[PDB]
Amino acid sequence: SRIFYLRNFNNWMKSVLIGEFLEKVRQKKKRDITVLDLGCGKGGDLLKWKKGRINKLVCTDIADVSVKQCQQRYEDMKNRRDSEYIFSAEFITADSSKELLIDKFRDPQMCFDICSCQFVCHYSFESYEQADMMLRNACERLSPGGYFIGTTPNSFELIRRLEASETESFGNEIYTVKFQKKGDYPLFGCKYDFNLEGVVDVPEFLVYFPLLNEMAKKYNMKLVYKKTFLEFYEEKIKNNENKMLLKRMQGGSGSKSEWEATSIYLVFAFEKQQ
Template identity: 60%
Template sequence: MELQSAKTETLKEGAGQRRHEEEEGGGQRRHEEGGGGGGRQKAPMKRRQEEERVSPPKKLVIDHSGKVASHYNSLQEVGLAVRSQSRIFFMRNFNNWLKSVLIGEILDQVRGSGSPKVSVLDLGCGKGGDLLKWRRGGINHLVCADIAGVSVDQCQSRYEDMKKKSQINEKLFSAQFINADCSKEVLSEKLDDPELLFDICSCQFVYHYSFESEQKADMMLRNACERLKPGGYFIGTTPDAFELVKRLEASDSLSFGNEVFKVSFQSKGFYPLFGCQYHFSLEDVVDVPESLVYFPLFEHMAKRYNMRLVVKQRFSEFFEEKVKKENHRSLMMKMMALQPFPCEDGGRQATDSRGEYDHAEEHCVRAGVQLPLGTLSRSEWEAASIYLVFIFQKMS
């Protein structure tokens, strides 16, 4: 099995410092022009006009919550046969495997700490893609919340269907489904049980939508963390801002990507801590505005809720560590998380584009590995390697 690794470079810093200096400088100029200490003061109208000239214009904050909800509400539910024809079929399986490993290991840690019953908050549940993971994990209660009402309805339908088909002797977890913008609304006020505390909050490929503003990012964190038990975990996956900026700066335009994904910015060289917007499109699955999550700031904000960072790994690092374990390799084969190269029994690769599997051939030669090899196409690796895994734990 093989994966191309990419070095993480530091996001361009200084945005906050420059903004702070500008605000400090503006304040100093206004103080001098206002005439303190017995100097002759200028007329109020004239002084106000001069203040307006030196004050930097306030940035217009655009709320993309409606666009995000509308996009996911409009996605059609398709069956396995259709999904298997997708250009990113194996990448989606790879991401799903990674989430399965993350969730499984966290559940083991929660049970290892002595929790007899496990309650989980799925923050940004979508259509319920992780319901089976929670079922396999044997949890007791699940709260699913998402901004897209249609997705929440589909998630609930999946759960009800799962309930009908469950074995007579199987005790399936109880569940509550909430349609809410978790970056604006207080989720605890919507819980059926106002005293409910969670062992785990899972936020998969969602948190970056909240980084449009400090208020939204903080509300999302509040919803994720304030109802966690001491020792509970906040886990998730999100794009790596450092990697996105590195690729943008290396590009000769305001966008980068390949045949499966594209990322477009409006400018480069200056990256505000909140509201640094870009547009992300991934085949037919995602086509929405997103925001960079500056991780050191994310980590700092989490401390407000008594959370400490336990793990932060790029997908490549997480993969290379977890694939060493036999049970994770076995699950990877079962979930078809990597594509055999070359295809056997007359099968076809995910793409016929030239150069998409050169890295696999080179790896075989360099490492002396025998074919077939488990891999993804170059374009899928490039898309998957944008993301990182994070795990926070609530301090006692």
């Protein structure tokens, strides 16, 4: 209830993001579309990927509960007696920061048209080795022209609020962010707690985007675009197709607290070169 409009927005944002890049891929492949969802969670991107008519989906999360949970969502959608075609899926429980997904694939020679990391990548930055391995699992299997897309905290905006704050903690009634130490912002291992209304689930790490961009180059990825949630909304809402979708999802106008929570995050996408 409290977080309603914010919940809606992220699924609007993720749908518009996926929809955009599924078109860019369809301008090339338009067949056997393979996708890797990193940190798939309990699913929820499933219905998004079905909408885009994906031919294959690899869902992976470090939590075995979320993976088995996500697998039931797929099966539930899959097992209707209807005609509707659903992507061939795959479910892999692994730590993508510390593990190599290539070993866990049914087909280890598998290639992906799209890799979606939604509110995940910031977890991998605990260390360089971890942060690089996550980029590896994602981008190494992208066939050229494929996209690495996702969403992570800004880290310009995060520190900006921290430095303005009197204590290490900052936020509002709908969310609370607590850094372990203020003023020290190491490229890796910079650690803070992200607590939505609820209990804080796991610590996050600071992702400075210029760094993520540099490390992505290792895997031959060039940045397509990087935009804050504010910039993304302003632009993509220009389309009156998308504006209908947001009012349909009943997202959009939130409390000043909800609108504050967003604009911390930024969407991004990379493209694999030859």
